[PDB]
Design an enzyme around this catalytic site. Structure first.
Site, short mmCIF file in Angstrom:
data_model
loop_
_atom_site.label_atom_id
_atom_site.label_comp_id
_atom_site.label_asym_id
_atom_site.label_seq_id
_atom_site.Cartn_x
_atom_site.Cartn_y
_atom_site.Cartn_z
N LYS A 1 0.80 -1.21 0.00
CA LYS A 1 0.00 0.00 0.00
C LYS A 1 0.83 1.27 0.00
O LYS A 1 0.32 2.32 -0.39
CB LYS A 1 -0.92 0.03 1.22
CG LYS A 1 -1.93 -1.09 1.26
CD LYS A 1 -2.81 -1.09 0.04
CE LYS A 1 -3.57 -2.41 -0.09
NZ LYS A 1 -4.38 -2.47 -1.34
N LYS B 1 1.81 5.32 -4.86
CA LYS B 1 2.51 4.06 -5.10
C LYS B 1 3.34 4.13 -6.36
O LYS B 1 4.47 3.61 -6.41
CB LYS B 1 1.50 2.92 -5.22
CG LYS B 1 0.73 2.60 -3.96
CD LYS B 1 -0.48 1.71 -4.27
CE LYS B 1 -1.66 2.11 -3.40
NZ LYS B 1 -2.84 1.23 -3.57
N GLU C 1 -5.09 -2.09 -11.17
CA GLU C 1 -6.06 -1.79 -12.21
C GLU C 1 -6.77 -0.46 -11.96
O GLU C 1 -7.49 0.01 -12.85
CB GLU C 1 -7.11 -2.90 -12.32
CG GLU C 1 -6.57 -4.20 -12.86
CD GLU C 1 -7.60 -5.31 -12.85
OE1 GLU C 1 -8.72 -5.09 -12.34
OE2 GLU C 1 -7.28 -6.41 -13.34
C1 LIG Z 1 -5.12 -7.22 -11.33
C2 LIG Z 1 -5.08 -6.63 -9.95
C3 LIG Z 1 -5.45 -5.32 -9.73
C4 LIG Z 1 -5.42 -4.75 -8.44
N1 LIG Z 1 -5.76 -3.43 -8.28
C5 LIG Z 1 -5.33 -2.86 -7.18
C6 LIG Z 1 -5.27 -1.44 -7.11
O1 LIG Z 1 -5.62 -0.72 -8.03
N2 LIG Z 1 -4.80 -0.88 -5.95
C7 LIG Z 1 -4.40 -1.65 -4.89
O2 LIG Z 1 -3.99 -1.05 -3.89
N3 LIG Z 1 -4.44 -2.99 -4.92
C8 LIG Z 1 -4.89 -3.58 -6.02
N4 LIG Z 1 -4.95 -4.95 -6.10
C9 LIG Z 1 -4.47 -5.76 -4.96
C10 LIG Z 1 -5.52 -6.73 -4.45
O3 LIG Z 1 -6.43 -6.09 -3.56
C11 LIG Z 1 -4.83 -7.91 -3.76
O4 LIG Z 1 -4.06 -8.63 -4.71
C12 LIG Z 1 -5.77 -8.88 -3.04
O5 LIG Z 1 -6.36 -8.21 -1.93
C13 LIG Z 1 -5.08 -10.14 -2.57
O6 LIG Z 1 -4.29 -9.90 -1.37
P1 LIG Z 1 -2.68 -9.88 -1.47
O7 LIG Z 1 -2.35 -9.36 -2.87
O8 LIG Z 1 -2.24 -8.95 -0.36
O9 LIG Z 1 -2.20 -11.31 -1.27
C14 LIG Z 1 -4.99 -5.55 -7.36
C15 LIG Z 1 -4.63 -6.88 -7.59
C16 LIG Z 1 -4.67 -7.42 -8.86
C17 LIG Z 1 -4.25 -8.85 -9.08
#
Ligand SMILES: Cc1cc2nc3c(=O)[nH]c(=O)nc-3n(C[C@H](O)[C@H](O)[C@H](O)COP(=O)(O)O)c2cc1C
Ligand SMILES: Cc1cc2nc3c(=O)[nH]c(=O)nc-3n(C[C@H](O)[C@H](O)[C@H](O)COP(=O)(O)O)c2cc1C
Lengths: 217, 216
Positions: free
Chosen positions: B13, B73, B164
């Site tokens: 984050k 970020k 995304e």
């Molecule tokens: C394709 C994709 C897009 C995501 N978009 C965002 C985003 O825009 N901002 C963000 O802070 N986290 C984003 N996430 C993070 C997800 O919230 C996170 O992968 C999910 O909560 C699983 O937990 P972990 O990644 O901590 O294991 C994204 C994850 C993926 C795979």
């Protein structure tokens, strides 16, 4: 960990040794890798069929008959075969399931924190399912992200694998009753150990040069 | 112990802007992008790798409006990757891929190259002629690359997050992607998390395998 060496050694297996099976511990690690892949908003919009019996693999292999017969043996001969499936629609119940699970795991200090998480996820989901009408594509993309995580993960375990799009996924969906359950199959990944006959294991790995694919700024 | 890596990585984050990748890590990052697998080795992708403040600012233009929460970020991570897909699978790209496979010594004979080219063209035609979904097919390969990349950088000891939540139309305009035959899909900042990012410490949450896995 030398993950780059793993990335340069892994390859798309062309023949599996049908006598070599995953250990019980490896099979558990395989499922952990599927489960713990990230995804957009932690939406986890996926289901996995993990076939390790002869009949289970033969059911998957039905989708590789005829046009895709060159992939049928890989499915039959590998130790464990994963069918990666995406949800067909992002429904309200699934959004609630994901956020309730995050609460159960202790990720929220307060109801307000859970509500903020639910609202943020619902915002993205609504953008796809209401505005763009592309939630099916959005979820399929998360499944492919899982596949990419999985292929590198099993390679790091010392296992061979191959991602397969060369099957009839309509047959696969029918065989496993996926549409009625809210899912559609996208990729098949057999996992195991390559056979002595598979000389693709030593063939040079080929990629376009970074001068073509990468811009540095 | 790749499972330990999978259980320790998380969606960062906040990044420590003072912690840069080493030169070797920066090279390894690009190797991971290059060497991801893809259907038919089609490699239908381009990557923008931003490592300067000026470059990151160009990417951060997309983290505007509703998406301002992702701007920091992009600015604070050491390296930021914009993952892009081709928008159409053209004959020239198919020939480029098979010519590169020949240059790398994957074919014993012209016949072997011809069979490889024919097989790839069969799949490409299924998407671009029959299903009219080659754009979706290629975007899926890019997401596979993202998944490989996130685990790879985690195994290197680097933090990352897939994003995304930016305006990809702005990103496409900023980099003139559409007229070149590309569209941006995911932004992945890479570096080291800030000590203030307590998401690093929170329990990882996933649905139980009883929900997501059927064993047969
Ligand atoms: C394709 C994709 C897009 C995501 N978009 C965002 C985003 O825009 N901002 C963000 O802070 N986290 C984003 N996430 C993070 C997800 O919230 C996170 O992968 C999910 O909560 C699983 O937990 P972990 O990644 O901590 O294991 C994204 C994850 C993926 C795979
Ligand atoms: C989504 C996907 C689908 C693929 N489909 C098949 C397939 O049906 N059969 C096969 O033998 N290889 C298949 N491949 C393997 C590719 O040809 C391979 O990944 C590519 O040539 C790169 O070489 P490498 O995987 O050996 O590094 C597939 C790969 C991906 C990522």
């Amino acid at each position: 960990m030398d993950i780059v060496s793993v990335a340069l050694k892994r390859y798309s297996t062309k023949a599996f040794d049908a006598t070599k099976k995953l250990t019980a511990g490896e099979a558990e690690q395989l499922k952990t890798l599927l489960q713990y892949s990230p995804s957009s908003t932690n939406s986890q919009p996926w289901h996995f069929i993990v076939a390790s019996t002869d009949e289970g693999k033969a059911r998957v292999a039905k989708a590789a008959s005829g046009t895709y017969v060159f992939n049928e043996r890989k499915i039959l001969d590998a130790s464990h075969v994963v069918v990666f499936c995406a949800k067909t629609a992002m429904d309200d119940a699934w959004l609630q399931r994901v956020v309730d699970q995050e609460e159960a795991d202790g990720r929220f200090a307060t109801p307000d924190a859970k509500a903020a998480n639910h609202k943020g996820r619902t915002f993205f989901a609504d953008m796809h399912r209401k505005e763009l009408k592309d939630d099916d594509q959005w979820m399929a993309k998360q499944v492919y992200l899982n596949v990419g995580n999985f292929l590198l993960g099993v390679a790091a375990m010392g296992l061979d694998a191959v991602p397969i799009e060369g099957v009839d996924f309509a047959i696969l969906d029918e065989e496993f009753d996926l549409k009625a359950q809210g899912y559609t199959s996208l990729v098949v990944v057999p996992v195991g150990h390559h056979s002595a006959e598979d000389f693709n294991a030593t063939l040079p790995k080929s990629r376009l040069p970074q001068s073509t694919t990468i811009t540095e700024i």
